[PDB]
Design a protein around this ligand. Structure first.
Ligand code: ANP
Ligand code: MG
Ligand code: MG
Lengths: 592, 593
């Protein structure tokens, strides 16, 4: 009788288990792809998120479950793809000749083949990442749901003349929407996901990534709070970001208490401008991006302006204060390779020349110069003559060899007058000027916040880490200007000794000289000048932090800092709109 | 010095910037008109509305509080019966009446309903004027007053089209109030409508769980499991409500309690009673006609005094009436006079067997075409062929004498009201949910959910025994503890003293004055025993049985009274988008020319 009544409950549980399955929510794994089509390269970023489907509630993504599985190989940039197409279909050296844009329309199928070659590489790489990281059970869930692809171009093609860029984006979307059926991964896109993103957007998404990963941004009671007047506020202060890329630099910070700004200065409300949903806590954010401020673009422009000044150029010898004592290189903006024998190899290839994007923009044949006098004077003040041919524009006139003086104070003074606070704004910065900021100094002058700042960038971090490693800066570094300027002054004024082990930076410790650290003093001066303006502003940040990636709750980092996670959250957090485009329409939309 | 001076102006802008960005709270009045069996009364409520930028206006469910239940005016049944008395001729209950011919008397029905609506409107305004201050009056008048008039057991069994036609007229009368008072009353066919017995019970369940803080969508009252399903932190409690003409038995089904195919349970979310954001529950809701205080009192006297075991030589021996108590043999209203005598009102309107005898007529299509309903009437001693007066008359009976036997009273309440052979008349709704009678409820469906008893006399049955120290101060709801206490109380003698009739308890326990409310309380005491007997017989037994009048709020003061009133408000207000469209977007402005 005991085992008879026991069997009855087993069958009762059997129905209850089945009844629970049909009423509860079911979690499935989904892959998300963000293709960073930057200045330096075009690379894939494979993410994984947990989807939850509930009866009568549809399917949604858990924002906290969003984690990067791998950032793919660095393939050819969109600028190179478009420039190669113009080299073969508009003739070689089109930069110095007047080109009829109307005639290029007959070469659209040929642009499709150029883009196809790059897209096939990115597709092959994405599949290789998914196949290596996902198990058979995970692969089935990933393949069934479809893979939303978001290809966003940044500073690389931001300044690109005529139609070309926008026409390429129409072709890029068709290539994503038509993937290889062999792999099984259902990649799909739309003009809302795959599109060129603005400098403000690039900065705003980078802000969303930082606050999401650091658990400062959220709509739950753990990260937010509803006051007695029904307004949602975040429990922790929202942090701002400074991202220094290859071609552009972004300065992003939220305004505390809604500080009164001038009419010319334009701040962006995250809810009002549809960046974050209404359920999220509101914030008015200042987001500005500066062209010719990124690692490579600033490096080329600085050499052009410094070696054009009579104070630094004497008898074909340009004295650079941002380069170490004893360092010698050719007078060009071309990529510098520090060879094992101490010598500096300067590649004079047009594609590899750091001035190239600026000299291509600064052309009398580009409608932004021929019709707009303001843009012509912006080029001419930075020594680029738009009338002159491409080679003559990139060439540092009456200069043969660049010698390193190692004076840090003189380097700060020059980074300030050229890059940070110039007379006229740096070329291709109409977006920044329309926000009310002609230059970096104007940012903290007109808009200031008591919100903590996060400095992001390979060289930005390297500048601080190098000084920390040699015991020039404390392990705990709040972001003191004088403390940094004293440490860098002692480091930049150190002799280069060519020894057996190669070129060594001799300090009263020692570090080897390479292609990444040879000009780090320009970035050290940039950090000093940047922190000087932050300390000059009416409102000062609570703390300044230098970070590569944010550590997750388990200890391991969830994702890397940048606009990647921000662009995902910009789409996924709008529950109804995401469900209609990613799940209702889906990959099935592409079917014939 | 000037730093503090510029800060005043900076604060001046911040204060103004906060006002536009923040939410603003305004007071709104809500009206629920209980158009029950016994009477038609207004219930004035007050709620806090919150308007937020881009979020519209919503009501805080927890802010809903009863300010006053108004005067008890004429029931909808009386209004319609008076109209038939004058427009279909007197004694229409015993004659065949052509319903088609009554359509020419619709404007005349409007005047009859207007008279009642003007009284209810005047009373509602009198409550609002006495409780609200000038600042409160402005907010209340500006937002408009949603009115929800719902009919129950009174017109639930009403024959032909008349009831539904009255409701079309009632809504027009609400939508057109006196502009002099300033209160903007408005209604719609979704708010003002006859509510079903299951709905009446379901709303009473929603009221109980809301006030006792068992039902909520917030983390304080609810919890989300690892599979995204919202469960309530505390067990949802069931309710037993005993009105004038009907009794409701409501309880939620705990766990995977498998029910038969014939038995119909209602899921609150699926049947659009509560929003999806609220925790789900499968609820058994059943209402029984002829079980309410007034209707059950009449039916019991008819069935008991028709049985040869209780009727001898014109003297009906009632076990539910005290020893020495004497009254005339009729279901009419009993008034206990100061000289110990029982005055029985022989007026047709005041007779408690009238609604049952009016339904049990061969001229009513529910009897003439449906043989099943005729046999339901005949088994309860009502002959549908006989005239109205002959139906209400207890044949071959002159005087009702009180025997005071509690065990015999329980046995009779059981066979007549609780578990009869055929279902009690006008109970098609109950039978369609799978319950022909009260005994069948706990036999087919049982729950481990705590039960709450509601009804003036149901509470009085417990309180009287508690007062005489027959029942403990702390009473969990033990069946045999109650039966022992009531048996000693019901066996009590009635002594006609200089002060009046007194209930003399045996073994010199105590004494209390006999009145028109407690003379037949032993029938209700037996009803409570029989009801608890079936609850204890069921597969699943409630955790505790509680007897409550009203639920005490967080401040200690009670927010509102128990019943279907708060439940019907929450049924509409909790659907944020739908409520905002009907109450605020359309509003009283919809009524404008
Ligand atoms: N003023 C009163 N307040 C409360 N109960 C009363 C009052 N007057 C009479 N009663 C008693 O309570 C019963 C009516 O209760 P009530 O709550 O008004 O239900 P109802 O609306 O008339 N019936 P129903 O149509 O089924 O909803 C009467 O039969 C009396 O026993
Ligand atoms: Mg970038
Ligand atoms: Mg009622």
């Amino acid at each position: 009788d005991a085992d008879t009544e026991k069997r009855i409950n087993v069958g009762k549980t059997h129905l209850q288990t089945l009844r629970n399955l049909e009423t509860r929510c079911h979690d499935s794994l989904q892959a998300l792809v963000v293709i960073d089509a930057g200045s330096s390269s075009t690379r894939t970023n494979v993410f994984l998120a947990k989807t939850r489907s509930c009866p009568n509630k549809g399917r949604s993504i858990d924002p906290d479950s969003i984690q990067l599985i791998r950032e793919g190989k660095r393939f050819t940039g969109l600028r190179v793809v478009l420039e190669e197409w113009l080299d073969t279909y508009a003739g070689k050296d089109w930069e110095s000749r007047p080109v009829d844009a109307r005639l290029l329309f007959q070469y659209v199928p040929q642009m499709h083949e150029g883009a196809k070659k790059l897209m096939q590489l990115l597709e092959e790489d994405t599949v290789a990442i998914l196949d290596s990281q996902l198990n058979e059970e995970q692969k089935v869930q990933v393949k069934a749901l479809g893979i939303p692809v978001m290809l966003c171009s940044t500073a690389g093609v931001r300044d690109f003349h005529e139609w070309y860029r926008d026409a390429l984006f129409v072709l890029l979307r068709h290539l994503i929407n038509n993937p290889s059926p062999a792999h099984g991964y259902k990649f799909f896109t739309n003009p809302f996901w795959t599109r060129p993103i603005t400098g403000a957007e690039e900065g705003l998404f980078a802000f969303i990534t930082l606050n999401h990963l650091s658990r400062r941004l959220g709509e739950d009671p753990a990260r937010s709070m509803i006051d007695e007047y029904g307004v949602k506020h975040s429990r922790n202060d929202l942090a701002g970001v400074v991202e220094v890329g290859g071609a552009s630099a972004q300065i992003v910070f939220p305004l505390q208490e809604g500080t009164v700004l001038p009419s010319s200065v334009r701040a962006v409300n995250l809810q009002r401008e549809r960046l974050l949903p209404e359920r999220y806590p509101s914030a008015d954010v200042v987001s500005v991006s500066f062209m010719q401020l990124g690692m490579a673009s600033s490096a080329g422009l600085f050499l052009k302006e410094l070696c054009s000044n009579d104070e630094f150029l004497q008898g074909g010898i340009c004295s650079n204060p941002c380069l170490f004592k004893g360092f010698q290189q050719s007078c060009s903006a071309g990529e510098v390779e520090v060879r094992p024998d101490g010598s500096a190899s300067v590649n004079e290839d047009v594609r590899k020349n750091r001035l190239k994007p600026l000299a291509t923009y600064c052309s009398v044949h580009n409608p932004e110069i021929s019709f707009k006098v303001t843009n012509e004077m912006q080029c001419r003040e930075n020594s680029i003559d738009p009338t002159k041919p491409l080679a003559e524009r990139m060439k540092i006139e009456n200069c043969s060899i660049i010698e390193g003086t190692g004076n840090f104070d003189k380097c700060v003074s020059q980074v300030e007058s050229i890059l940070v606070a110039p007379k006229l704004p740096l070329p291709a910065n109409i977006e920044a000027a329309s926000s009310g900021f002609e230059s970096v100094d104007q940012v903290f002058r007109f808009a200031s916040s008591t919100a903590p700042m996060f400095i992001t960038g390979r060289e930005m971090l390297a500048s601080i880490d190098t000084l920390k490693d040699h015991r020039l800066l404390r392990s705990d570094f709040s972001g003191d200007v004088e403390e940094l300027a004293e440490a860098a002054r002692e480091f930049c004024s150190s002799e280069v000794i060519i020894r057996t082990d190669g070129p060594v930076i001799q300090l009263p410790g020692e570090q080897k000289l390479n292609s990444l650290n040879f000009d780090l003093c320009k970035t050290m001066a940039l950090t000093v000048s940047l922190l000087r303006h932050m300390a000059a502003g009416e409102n000062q940040p609570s703390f300044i932090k230098w970070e590569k990636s944010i550590a997750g709750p388990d200890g391991k980092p969830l994702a890397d800092l940048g606009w990647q996670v921000g662009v995902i959250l910009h789409h996924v957090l709008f529950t109804e709109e995401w469900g209609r485009t990613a799940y209702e329409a889906g990959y099935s939309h592409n079917l014939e």
